[PDB]
Symmetry: C4
Amino acid sequence: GSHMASSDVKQELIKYGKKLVETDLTKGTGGNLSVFDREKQLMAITPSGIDFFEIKESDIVVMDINGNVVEGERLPSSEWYMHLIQYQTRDDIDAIIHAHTTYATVLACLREPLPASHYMIAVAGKDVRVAEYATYGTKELAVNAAKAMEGRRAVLLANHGILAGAQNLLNAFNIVEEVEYCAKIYCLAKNFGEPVVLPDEEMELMAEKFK
Amino acid sequence: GSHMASSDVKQELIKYGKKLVETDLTKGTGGNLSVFDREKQLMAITPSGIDFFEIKESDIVVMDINGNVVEGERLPSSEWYMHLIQYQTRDDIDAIIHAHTTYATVLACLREPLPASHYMIAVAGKDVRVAEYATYGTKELAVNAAKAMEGRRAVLLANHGILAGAQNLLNAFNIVEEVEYCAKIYCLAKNFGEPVVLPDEEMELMAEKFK
Amino acid sequence: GSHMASSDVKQELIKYGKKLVETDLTKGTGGNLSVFDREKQLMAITPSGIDFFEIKESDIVVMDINGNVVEGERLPSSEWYMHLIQYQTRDDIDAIIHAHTTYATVLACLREPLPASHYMIAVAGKDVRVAEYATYGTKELAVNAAKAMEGRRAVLLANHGILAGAQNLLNAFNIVEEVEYCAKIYCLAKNFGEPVVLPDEEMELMAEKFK
Amino acid sequence: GSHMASSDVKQELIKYGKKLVETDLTKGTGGNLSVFDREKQLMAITPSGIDFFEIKESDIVVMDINGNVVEGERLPSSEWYMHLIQYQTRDDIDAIIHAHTTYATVLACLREPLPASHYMIAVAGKDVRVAEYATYGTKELAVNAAKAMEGRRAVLLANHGILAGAQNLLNAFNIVEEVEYCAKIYCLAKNFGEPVVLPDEEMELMAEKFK
Ligand code: NI
Ligand code: NI
Ligand code: NI
Ligand code: NI
Ligand SMILES: [Zn+2]
Ligand SMILES: [Zn+2]
Ligand SMILES: [Zn+2]
Ligand SMILES: [Zn+2]
């Protein structure tokens, strides 16, 4: 009666699901959100194949650290293990958003990383890497994403989309938004000429300012 | 009094017509939707040259399998035969949407097919072909589209737009949305570099996962 | 008390002004609309430098065929003569919209015409020409636009925007929308490869079908 | 009780903050607005790291000409000195908007200036320069922006965004909007071919017409 993920967290997943569509970051398809409660060691995650605008609190799936479902009758997001393995391996990430955005996914389909052509990428790191390709919803994708997000708060998923993580959903959402913006700026700059990339020293400074 | 297409289906055509404009997939011009009732062998289709936001149930045109109008005083969509020939030749398609979208139409005007640069194209097939050009509203266009959509759930219409089909309008709409997204990703990737295309084996796997 | 432009026409100018912003064709700046009453030989036109969402019926300016203001205390659109000279020289145009759209203006800034890469351009003609450059609001621009719109229902204004005309504002608006769409398709196709342009014979056929 | 910045000015900052998001010029992050009262010699500026839709009048920070905070408990925008140095060095600017827009920022990340491919750039000058890069929120950025905006009403901030100034917030907002539009037209034209740039003499004429 207090042992499971709170109503607050479930409602918040729904809120940010909607925000992703409202701001036109994604239509929702193949996208998913989760939060991890560190005290309880439970992940709450969006369900598979339900439109973001139709998700109810009862559709949220709650899982333990080994992926055993403890609340919810819906099937969890097909990407549940991609989220869970992050929480298993990183203490600095308590909320994750996966989305099929526009320019971030362009870069992912080129299998091209995103460098510091705009300073705001420092919300994720000096750059955003591209994970090795693996089929959606597989262990291979989960592992590939974990590895390529090491030392970063976002990662591109080859031929697929983006994954971002932060301390909470507001910050995770901000990272998705900012990485998508940076991806867009970078791609558009590439059309015109050679984007100027800020040096690592400047990005190291940026990281410290952003704290 | 039960022999014709239901009110439910007519209202649904109107709903999805509106959804196409609301989500900015199209302005509506030259676009059309239909459903086929297999038990009754009747097609219900949107009328010609009426703004999607002004279509009433009484403007929906109902036709038999040979194109004889049995309900409605409005002229049917100029593309009625492009829809009807699909229903005549395919048992797996009960709803069709034709739209003049953005990047899908870019590809159509280049007469360039859409490959699997993004895995989500599997909602339509391993790729989306481009039909041979023919004048809008003609038998030639209908036949060209039927042939080039064989084995797929979407097809590009040269210098024109897109046609998609599925089991119902919700799924047909999802295909239009997803194919337009994939077209956009592919085009934008082409601007930057060489889009990475997933191999046929992976797409065959994708088809099976999507079932 | 019946000798001037009707309330109906004034309200309609306001309506379509708003529609241009609502549909994101333009923000309104430098844009203008007019209608010509053939029986009365009066042009009603939007005023200069008033936000489309702030235009009242009393701000509409009514002019005779020689540009003498007969109703309204506001200064007419700076482009009033670009509209008026069309009505003076063409009997087939009773409403005109000028807008600074996106891709149509891209083409205008390249001083590149728009060909029939998409069949829908037939709402304006087989192609849309680019007028010789002249300073906004000048007689030279008015004359350049008249000449380059001959035989067409739209024209690009070099380094400036688009002008379209039709029998009424609904149709003029549709032309702006469709020409902007075609411009966009053409530009985007050019990024990928060589847009396929429909031959003049097919466009001649298109003109006859569109009647 | 009359010695500080008025309620009117504070509310107006909030209004234009919102307008920047409503019109999709920016999401708000890293963006800021200010006004300078010349009689009082006070700058009112938006606060740091508060969503534009959550800013209250009490969050507005008021500063004297040397940057001493005289009203507000919130930390001022990190860019407060970039705004303040403009007011210190220019008598023709009483309101400033900084934004991370799209195509203007593309140009900034290329470190490419914006020329007169569209005549509307005359709201800012014959062209818009790019300032030397410096870290956000620093004196160096403030000085670089002051220098590169000399003789202009807008400037691009390398790898960052845009700064614009005018007599009031309505006009400053219009400059941001118009410069972003011009940047977009220029970038898109560059994709197709060589944008035609209006000569300085024509732009000198444009400046005089715009007065
Ligand atoms: Ni409990
Ligand atoms: Ni019946
Ligand atoms: Ni009268
Ligand atoms: Ni006081
Ligand atoms: Zn996904
Ligand atoms: Zn069509
Ligand atoms: Zn204009
Ligand atoms: Zn900034």
